[PDB]
UniProtKB/Swiss-Prot annotation:
Protein name: Myoglobin
Any one GO molecular function term: oxygen binding
Lineage: Eukaryota, Metazoa, Chordata, Craniata, Vertebrata
Residues recorded as bearing Phosphoserine in the entry: S3
A single GO cellular-component term on record: sarcoplasm
Length: 153
């Protein structure tokens, strides 16, 4: 797993996110949909959107990004002990919405990019390696649940 130091650095930068969660949700999702447009097809409410200006104007997108970052903060705050938090998330991402593990890799990279961009002072090298590991652990444990659920992610 991660060390105490690695978790502490994860949780430090997450406090920056939580100081404006909607702002962060919007930029992560815009980074995701612009880098990997096939991911936007997953979101029926706003898959019709084409430009970053449309994306920024969208209340629905802002709302979903807040829900996503809020849930990830919940997981992260457990520092690995996130069975209860991961369970319903694996379940909906393997059944209701079928989210490939590759797309979880894209949004992880989007998070890391947005954090480096907005919080260089709380996100230098060590901190980046630690968030890298925390999101790898998240994706690996979600994959293990996907298998159980009958979804080849
Ligand atoms: C950091 C990784 C992610 C976290 C913590 C996360 C979390 C969540 C949460 C808490 C919800 C709402 C409740 C639920 O259905 O369980 C949600 C909904 C959703 N997520 Fe995920 N998510 C992640 C990544 C992704 C990715 C990469 C995609 C698609 C490429 C995606 C697609 C969806 C869709 C389509 C919904 C339904 C949204 C709606 O209400 O219109 N998620 N996610
Ligand atoms: Na531990």
């Amino acid at each position: 797993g991660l060390s105490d130091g690695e978790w502490q650095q994860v949780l430090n930068v997450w406090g920056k996110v939580e100081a404006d969660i909607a702002g962060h949700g919007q930029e992560v999702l815009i980074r995701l949909f612009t880098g990997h447009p096939e991911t936007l097809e997953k979101f029926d409410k706003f898959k019709h959107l084409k430009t970053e200006a449309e994306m920024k104007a969208s209340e629905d997108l802002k709302k979903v990004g807040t829900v996503v970052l809020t849930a990830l903060g919940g997981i992260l705050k457990k520092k690995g002990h996130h069975e209860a938090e991961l369970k319903p998330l694996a379940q909906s991402h393997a059944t209701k919405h079928k989210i490939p593990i590759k797309y979880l890799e894209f949004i992880s990279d989007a998070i890391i990019h947005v954090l480096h961009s907005k919080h260089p002072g709380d996100f230098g090298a060590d901190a980046q390696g630690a968030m890298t590991k925390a999101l790898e652990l998240f994706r690996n444990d979600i994959a293990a649940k996907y298998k159980e659920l009958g979804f080849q992610g």
